[PDB]
Amino acid sequence: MLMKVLTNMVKLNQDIIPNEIYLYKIFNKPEDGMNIYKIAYRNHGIVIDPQNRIIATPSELEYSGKFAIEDEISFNELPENYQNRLVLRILRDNGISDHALSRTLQKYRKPKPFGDFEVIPEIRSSVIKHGGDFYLVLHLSHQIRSKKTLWELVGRNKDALRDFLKEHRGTILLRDIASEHKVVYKPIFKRYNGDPDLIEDNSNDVEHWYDYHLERYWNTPELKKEFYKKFGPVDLNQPIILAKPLRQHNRGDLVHLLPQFVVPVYNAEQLNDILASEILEYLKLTSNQRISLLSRLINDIKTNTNIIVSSLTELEANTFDVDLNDMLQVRNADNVKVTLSELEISKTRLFTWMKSRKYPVILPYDIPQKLKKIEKIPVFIIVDSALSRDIQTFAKDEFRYLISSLQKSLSNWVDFPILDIRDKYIFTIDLTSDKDIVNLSIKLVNLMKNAELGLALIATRTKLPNETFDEVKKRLFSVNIISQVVNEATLYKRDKYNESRLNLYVQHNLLFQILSKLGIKYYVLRHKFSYDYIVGIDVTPMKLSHGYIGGSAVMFDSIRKIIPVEIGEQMGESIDMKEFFKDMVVQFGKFGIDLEGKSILILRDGKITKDEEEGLAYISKVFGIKITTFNIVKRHLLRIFANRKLYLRLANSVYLLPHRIKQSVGTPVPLKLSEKRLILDGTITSQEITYNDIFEILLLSELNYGSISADMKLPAPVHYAHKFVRALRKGWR
Amino acid sequence: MLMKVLTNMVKLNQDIIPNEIYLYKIFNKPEDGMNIYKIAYRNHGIVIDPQNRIIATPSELEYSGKFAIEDEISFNELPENYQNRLVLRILRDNGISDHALSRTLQKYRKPKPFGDFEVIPEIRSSVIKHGGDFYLVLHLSHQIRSKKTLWELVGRNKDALRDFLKEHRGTILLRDIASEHKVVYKPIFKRYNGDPDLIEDNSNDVEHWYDYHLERYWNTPELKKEFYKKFGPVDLNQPIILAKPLRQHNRGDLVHLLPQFVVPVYNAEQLNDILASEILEYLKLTSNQRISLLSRLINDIKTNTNIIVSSLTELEANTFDVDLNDMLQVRNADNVKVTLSELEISKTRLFTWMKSRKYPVILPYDIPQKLKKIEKIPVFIIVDSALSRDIQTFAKDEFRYLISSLQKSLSNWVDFPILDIRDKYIFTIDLTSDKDIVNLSIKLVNLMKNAELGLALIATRTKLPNETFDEVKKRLFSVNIISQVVNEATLYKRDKYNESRLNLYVQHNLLFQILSKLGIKYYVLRHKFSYDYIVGIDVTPMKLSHGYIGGSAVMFDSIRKIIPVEIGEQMGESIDMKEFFKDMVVQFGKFGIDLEGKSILILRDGKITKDEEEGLAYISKVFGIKITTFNIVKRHLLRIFANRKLYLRLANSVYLLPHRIKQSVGTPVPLKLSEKRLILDGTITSQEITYNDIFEILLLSELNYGSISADMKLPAPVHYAHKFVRALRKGWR
DNA sequence: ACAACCTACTACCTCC
DNA sequence: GGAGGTAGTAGGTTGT
DNA sequence: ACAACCTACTACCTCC
DNA sequence: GGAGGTAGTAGGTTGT
Ligand SMILES: [Mg+2]
Ligand SMILES: [Mg+2]
Ligand SMILES: [Mg+2]
Ligand SMILES: [Mg+2]
Ligand SMILES: [Mg+2]
Ligand SMILES: [Mg+2]
Ligand SMILES: [Zn+2]
């Protein structure tokens, strides 16, 4: 349980660190311009307090406005984050910047052309303090940009431009490269015709726009010839696209763009299958390739300067190698609580007994008492009419096979209701058409009068307008219908024993999803954690609004129960823990549980804000509950070059690897755990992450209810809070 | 049915009208600055098409950028609105502007000081085309501004400033008058302490801010002495208020303000009772005072120039004088459908029989079959603990008297359930405290286990933090509780026969509200309108978000039914009629009504947008329904100097007066009806407002369900859509 | 060159 | 939209 | 001086 | 917060 691992950190020279810094206060108003952060960057400093406009600089200020000397403190008196940012700024001042590192890296990884796009390497940097030393963290990435403008790409043809804009509807963005500041625009399509909104023959406006761009932004001899080389001569036979800015405040302003001054943003959708596979294999590097590239780059840096005094840093990691099957509980042979380990099986082989008698029978553990009194559950099959008359029959017979096999296997051993499928429940409609959806909704309302729950298996085409999908799901949810969607590409996936059945992998996943959505828990956990309630919290935007619904809290009370609650409605990303916790108390008050004197573990997907801190402190002071908070981060610049479950104690954080990558390309991304806090009687104190906390987090990372081959990274409460806020954002119930 | 009335319009000279205009196209991008409308105003023109940047100017352009000549059309070829705006701009160019008219008006109405505020007259202008002539519409108003800064107002005392900021919490705004552009700021209070957030002793920052404002905005000798005269010498013993801008985008930026460079915005709340009454009597002018002021102003204008060629214009108005009691239906003497006219009564005397036997007994008309099978309806009384031990007893005994009288009067004649009041249902809690609300909610959840509906009568204090009110209402609504709130000021209102009972007016209103909220319709209408469905639509903001919930549609199907629907969630003010009408069809599909081949009358509170037009056209084309749309406007600059129900056909609009003012101060504001449209098979045509349409609108303006003495202006569907969008915005159910 | 993060969309590769 | 991983592209929020 | 409108808060005056 | 009127104060959206 101890292994040597390599990271992407290099130790820096200790003579870069400054001796003492100066604190300065800027007297200025934020409605005149020149943001404070830009000022602090100009004078080689950082921002300590943005409210009071206090900045820290290793030298005397050179500002023009009003400032005042505040303090002359030592470097070691600063917190760790400010020290890291100051060291990063100093490194940037000494030539160790992302741009220079990327330029050096281009000597070992030349730019590569994929179709009409070009891929160029890039390096991101960070600074980390560990063991009293400062390390530079280097992250490898790529940048893909288009090389041909839209007119050159379509081949100078108006029909080609129209077809290109029509095919990539919803995933197309244009960037105007003929102006000073580049803005990303989204084209405008007719709301009912589904056609791009162009201006066919207005050559006068084409010439006027061309001359306006020429004599306003490129008004200098070398700039003039650069413009004429980059864009060429004006083509008067081109249309004019009518678009709107991607900002979410200038959408009420429509702009006319020539399809010659703009380039397309990259979306994997604008590449064929071969090029998509090649580019995805090219971008997703492995551990050894990253190690080799970083070693060559570091050698080139060290042979050029004296700042870096080491190489890829080796650290100590503790390897988790417990047996999780001992903690997973299931029932077999008519209600006998057992474990997966004792049955020489795994979580992935819990449906194999439905056709082969060699393997043992594994029954579900807890069937809810509500899904036992129902006599019949209507089953509906909805097949899209845009299929090829063979995918339709395949979809129907596969759905019938799945339902029949599930019923026959489940009814033999355990009690289970009748999932009745009838010829009056199969519908073939056009999904895009609006009248058919209304007729289907009315028919489903009429057919489910004497019923409580219903299940619908839907078969759709390869791509949908992405709003018809949500509308269909919402219309089904409004009448108590659990919908399972299978598209055409999945239906085209073939087995290898008989081509008349779906892939066994997809079949098992489909049974698992049906059972989970119905409410049946196939397996549970065994372990006791020290808390009575675990609350996972997440935030998401609001789908066409500058607000944030951003409210979801999964209380995993019981490890079993999964009940969610909605927080409310916010303006930014800051949960209101006061109202949230008042509703928190009220709900188990109505259930009959006193939420006083208990312990609550809060897992937030992101970072806890100051307002949430104050709300939690007030709630603990008033209602008398002990609160424990954790910060979980999924995206950072640190990579651990290993493929195994482990955890690394670095600085004041714990980098966990709760999963193993199954693919042969890609470096696993660790999960950062930081800022453990304890709130008691209105007092907030910091704590240290114990091994028990890491064990509890790793155990919560198991227990997925969506797939049998899942290896998810986040804990269960956070993942399910994310899914619940997904559901609330898109309006599903 | 024909009366001469006076308006606030004066005929202009016909030689002001221009001969021909020029259309110009501006080639510019809207991310560089200098808005198009400002340009068009500079060159004495108007904006025709803002998307294509087309402007109309009575002279040749003098622009500096790129423009192009588009057309040279005649004046008479323009639509009416563009002609009105062009005439308004020309009048402004010829000296007839709001500023000059207000300055002239100040000679007859001198500024008046009310406490620390000053009231100054003001005149607003508009242009209207009628009968081929152009009229100037003049509206009289007032403007109230503070004369003393905050420091001078509080008397240069920190305790006084703290108390002033604490007392006017939530309704206080400061405007910074020491800068170039004036911004309105809102102070910041502690979230739990309820105290203003100041900075007590930081005289260094006070001096620095003073010098920063002095040497940046007032940097010129006469400007320097003006600054020193307006603000005086710097007081180093003053605190610093920490506030945020009222913009709804810069709230994430905190600004420090000296309480010497800011003035308070006017809110009637910063005046005592005597001054409030005096200022409200002073602002609310009557018809004769307005006529005299306008006549003197018009005489002064005519004696100075030759543009105005007339005086206050007399027009023709048709006076409605029908008997509405013939159309109101009610039941009396054990289910006998009668009318109010035949019983020599009015809508206001339908509760007098509960204590005096001289007047006839008037029973309700339709009691829902759902409010008949209930055995008992629990009644709760909630009394605030911040009262004076006498208002509490008055509240309890008044509520008991109301419930007892209602039950005793209703049970004698018609069937009605038991509104059981018990000593276990009276609670005295502190409303502001948070623990008490949770305890009360838990107790109410426990007490209403074996129940369906409940009614709660709440007695509160004079003022509440305005969020505790909404929280209490939401918590009661979540558990099926209809709440009726009576504050302390209403409870202090005395009768004139016995001081131990509430005012008869308020009592009758309270029983009416209880009966309406329970769901009982005391009276209905008799008349048949030509439509099968009337849909009222409204929009409101979203309560701390830059989104617009803005979704409410009352389908008044039946005149009786009142069922609402929620439209959805928008970004601006533009209803999505496609999704709205799909849900529209689905709902009566589930009820069993085919919404095809019918006629629908849409009343929108505001103006129908282009997107709603296209959506309605598409829906009519697809589902085959005839749509009739109306535009209703409540705020304009036109006044009819009369007090009687009538309608005036002016230009292409109808100005209705569906109500009569009961007070002795104020001029009634007419309702503008315009832009009647008929959508059939995807074709949108304009129509002319018939007398039948005006009669139908006037009839819909009756039948209020909130008060017995109501004289509301808007039609019932629009008013109830407004109330429903109120309910959705604040989260009540 | 404001740094650390979080969204919303993509696309391929793997599992009993 | 079999669901989990990992790649990219644009947008927003929070520091105190 | 972009014009017409719509919000959200206020405050008094009237009714059988 | 008896509800409808009429007064003011700041903010936003739509023109096509
Ligand atoms: Mg799913
Ligand atoms: Mg999050
Ligand atoms: Mg999330
Ligand atoms: Mg409105
Ligand atoms: Mg409204
Ligand atoms: Mg009310
Ligand atoms: Zn916004």
The nucleotide minimizing the C1' distance to residue A483's CA is: D1
The reply to whether B393 and B472 lie within a common domain is: yes
Q: Which residues of A touch B582 (CB under 8 A)?
A: 434, 437-438
Among A481, A501, A518, the domain boundary falls at A518
Amino acid at B621: K
- One-letter amino acid at A124 equals R
- Annotation-wise, does A605 bind a ligand? yes
The CA distance from B561 to B564, in Å, is 10
What is the strand order of the sheet A454-459 is part of? Answer: A421-429, A379-384, A454-459, A481-486
Domain count along chain A: 4
Residue from A589, A590, A600, A489 nearest A553 by CA: A600
* B586 to A442: CB separation less than 8 angstroms, yes or no: yes
* Residue B97, C-beta contacts closer than 8 angstroms, at least 6 positions apart: B91, B125
User: Same structural domain for residues A413 and A545?
Assistant: no
Q: How far apart are CA B445 and CA A585, in angstroms?
A: 13
Instruction: Give all strands (DSSP E) within A451-576, no chain letters.
Output: 454-459, 481-486, 524-525, 533-538, 552-555, 564-565
Is the same domain home to A534 and A588? yes
Solved with: cryo-EM
Compute, in angstroms, the gap from residue B37 CA to the centroid of ligand 1. 49
CA B608 to chain centre: 18
State how beta strands A533-538 and A599-605 pair: parallel
3-state helix/strand/coil string of B8-58: CEEEECCCCCCCECEEEEEECCCCCCCCHHHHHHHCCCEEEECCCCEEEEC
CA atoms within 13 A on the CB side of A548: 14
What resolution in Å is listed for this PDB structure? 2.9
**Which residue in the list B430, B573, B579, B594 is annotated as catalytic?**
B573
Ligand nearest to the CA of A725: 3
Last residue of a domain, one of B241, B260, B279: B260
Among B516, B540, B458, which Cα is nearest to B710's?
Answer: B516
**C1' (C9) to CA (A481) span, angstroms:** 27
Nearest to A524 by CA among A686, A342, A366, A336: A366
Q: How far does residue A627's CA lie from ligand 3's centre (Å)?
A: 22
The residue from B398, B488, B557, B605 that is catalytic is B605
- A:701-720 Cβ neighbours of strand C under 7 Å: 707-709
Pairing of strands B3-6, B9-11: unpaired
Return the structure tokens found at B509: 């209103």
Long-range contacts of B249-256 (CB under 8 A, 24+ apart): B249/B546, B250/A30, B250/A31, B251/A571, B252/A572, B253/A30, B254/A51, B254/B188, B255/A29, B255/A30, B255/B185, B256/B199, B256/B205, B256/B209
Q: Are residues B534 and B603 in the same domain?
A: yes
Same domain (yes/no): A412, A456:
yes
Please report, rounded to whole angstroms, the spatial distance between the CA atom of protein residue B662 and the C1' atom of nucleotide E12.
13
Protein-contacted positions of strand E (CB under 7 Å): 1-16
Partner-chain residue, chosen from A191, A542, A585, that has the shortest CB–CB distance to B614? A191
Residue B407 domain-assigned (yes or no): yes
Q: Which residues contact A659 (CB under 8 A, 6 or more apart)?
A: A645, A668, A701, A711, A712, A713
For residue B35, the chain A residues in CB contact (below 8 A) are none
Do residue B476 and residue B574 come from a single domain? no
Contact across the interface for B442 and A586, Cβ inside 8 Å: yes
Q: How far is B473 from B466, CA to CA, in rounded Å? A: 11
**3-class SS shares of chain B: helix, strand, coil, % to 5:** 30, 25, 45
Q: Is B229 within the bounds of a domain?
A: yes
Distance (Å, whole) CA A423 – CA A405: 18
Longest dimension (CA), chain B: 87
Measured CA distances, B360 to A606, B339, B505, B512, B703 (Å): 70, 13, 19, 18, 21
Pairing of strands B337-339, B255-257: unpaired
A208 appears as a binding residue in the annotation: no
Structure-block tokens of residue A128:
């980390």
Residues of B in contact with A623 (CB under 8 A): 435
CA distance A534 to A561: 10
Q: Which residues contact A692 (CB under 8 A, 6 or more apart)?
A: A530
Q: Which residue of B has its CA nearest to A549?
A: B545
Q: Is the CB of A283 less than 7 A from some atom of nucleic acid strand D? A: yes
Cβ-defined contact of B254 to A51 (cutoff 8 Å): yes
Who contacts A535 (Cβ-Cβ below 8 Å, separation ≥6)? A553, A554, A555, A556, A584, A600, A601, A602, A603, A717
CB within 8 Å of A174: residues ≥ 6 apart: A150, A184, A185, A186, A187, A241, A243, A257, A262, A263, A264, A265
Q: Are B681 and B717 in a shared domain? A: yes
Angle at CA of residue B16, ends B15 and B19, nearest 5°: 80
Note the CA–C1' distance, B277 to E12, in angstroms. 6
- Facing B585 at nearest CB: one of A30, A438, A590: A438
Q: Per the annotation, does A573 bind a ligand?
A: yes
The range of the structural domain enclosing residue A381 comes to 329-518
List the shell of residues around ion ligand 5, using CB closer than 5 Å. B 538, 722
User: CA–C1' distance A658–C14 (Å)?
Assistant: 18
Nearest CA to CA, how far is B221 from chain A (Å)?
21
- Does residue A513 sit in the same domain as residue A547? no
- Return the residue in B24, B25, B26, B27 with the most chain A beta carbons within 10 A, the one to mutate for interface testing: B27
Cα B430 to middle of ligand 1, angstroms: 47
Query: How far apart are alpha carbons A464 and A432 in whole angstroms?
Result: 8
Running DSSP on this structure, what letter comes out for residue B320? P
| B245 chain-A contacts, CB cut-off 8 A | 31
- Measured in Å, residue A573 CA sits from the centre of ligand 6 at 33
Interchain CB distance below 8 Å, B183 and A31: yes
CA distance linking residue A268 with residue B119, whole number of Å: 64
Read off the amino acid at residue A220.
Answer: T
Distance from Cα B486 to the centre of ligand 6, integer Å: 9
DSSP state of B531: -
A496 touches strand C (CB under 7 A): no
- Please name the residue whose C-alpha is nearest to the C1' of nucleotide E13: B663
Give the residue nearest to nucleotide D4 (CA to C1').
Answer: A710
Gap between the Cα atoms of A575 and A458, Å rounded:
36
A732 CB neighbours strand C below 7 A: no
Mapped onto helix, strand or coil, the DSSP state of residue A175 is strand
Q: Buried (b) or exposed (e) across A417-437, using 16+ Cβ within 10 A?
A: bebebeeebebebebeebeeb
| Ligand 3 geometric centre to CA of A550 (Å) | 9
Q: What is the DSSP string of B197-264?
A: ----S-HHHHHHHHHHHHHHH--SHHHHHHHHHHH-S--TT---EEEEESSSSSTTS-EEE-TTSEEE
The C1' atom of D12 and the CA atom of A248 lie apart, in whole Å, by 10
A486 C-alpha to center of ligand 1: Å?
10
Which CATH number does the domain housing residue A584 bear?
3.30.420.10
Q: Catalytic: which of B176, B538, B693, B696?
A: B538
- Please give the structure tokens belonging to residue B159: 């305790």
Does A545 sit within 8 Å of B571, measured CB to CB?
yes
**Domain final residue pick, A260, A285, A319:** A260
Active site residues of A: 538, 573, 605, 722
Q: Please, what is the angle between helix B287-302 and helix B98-105, to 10°? A: 110
Q: In terms of DSSP H, where are the helices of B346-390?
A: none
Cα–Cα distance for residue pair A276/A716, rounded to 1 Å:
33
CB hemisphere CA count around A384 (13 angstroms): 22
Annotated binding site of B for Mg(2+): 513, 538, 573, 605, 722
- Beta-carbon pairs below 8 A across chains A and B: 125
Shared domain check, B477 and B609: no
Question: Is residue A310 assigned to a domain?
Answer: no
Distance from CA of B507 to the nearest CA of A (A): 34
Nucleotide nearest to A493 (CA to C1'): D2
- Give the SS3 label for residue A500: coil
Closest nucleotide to B54's CA, by C1' atom? F16
Structure tokens belonging to residue A486: 């299978």
Residue B359 lies in a domain: no
Residue B193, domain member (yes or no)? yes
Buried b / exposed e over A351-381, threshold 16 CB at 10 Å, is: bebbeeeebeebbbbebeeeeeeeeebbbbb
Residue A24 · residue A55 · CB < 8 Å: yes
| Same domain, yes or no: B511 and B536 | no
Is A612 annotated in some ligand binding site?
no
| Domain shared by A593 and A471, yes or no | no
Residues 6 or more apart in contact with residue A228 via CB below 8 angstroms: none
Q: b or e along B380-405 (b: 16 or more beta carbons within 10 Å of the residue's beta carbon)?
A: bbbbbeebeeebbebbbebbeebbee
Cβ of A291 less than 7 A from strand D: no
Q: Can you point out the beta strands (E) in A563-719?
A: 564-565, 599-605, 626-633, 646-650, 653-657, 671-680, 683-686
Report long-range pairs for B582-589 (Cβ below 8 Å, ≥24 apart): B582/A434, B582/A437, B582/A438, B584/B535, B584/B553, B584/B555, B585/A438, B585/B623, B586/A438, B586/A441, B586/A442, B586/A445, B586/A475, B588/B557, B589/A438, B589/A441, B589/A442, B589/A445
CATH number assigned to the domain comprising residue A174: 3.90.70.180
Name A280's Cβ contacts closer than 8 Å, sequence gap at least 6. Answer: A268, A665
Contacts of A480 in chain B (CB under 8 A): none
Residues from chain B contacting residue A30 (CB–CB below 8 Å):
250, 253, 255
Residue B225 lies in a domain: yes
Distances (CA, A) of A133 to A9, A636, B621: 11, 20, 73
Please tell me which of the candidates A435, A437, A586 has its beta carbon nearest to residue B438: A586
How far is it, in rounded angstroms, from Cα A375 to Cα B200?
A: 72
What residues of chain A lie within 8 A of the CB of B203, using their CB?
A: none
Q: Cα separation of B261 and B255, whole Å?
A: 13
Q: In 3-state terms, what secondary structure has residue B381?
A: strand
* Structural domain includes residue B4: no
Whether residue B319 is contained in a domain is answered as no
- Asked whether the beta carbons of residue B590 and residue A445 sit closer than 8 angstroms, the reply is yes
- Considering the domain architecture, whether residues A560 and A514 belong to the same structural domain is answered as no
Q: Within a 10 A sphere around the Cβ of B669, how many other Cβ atoms? A: 17
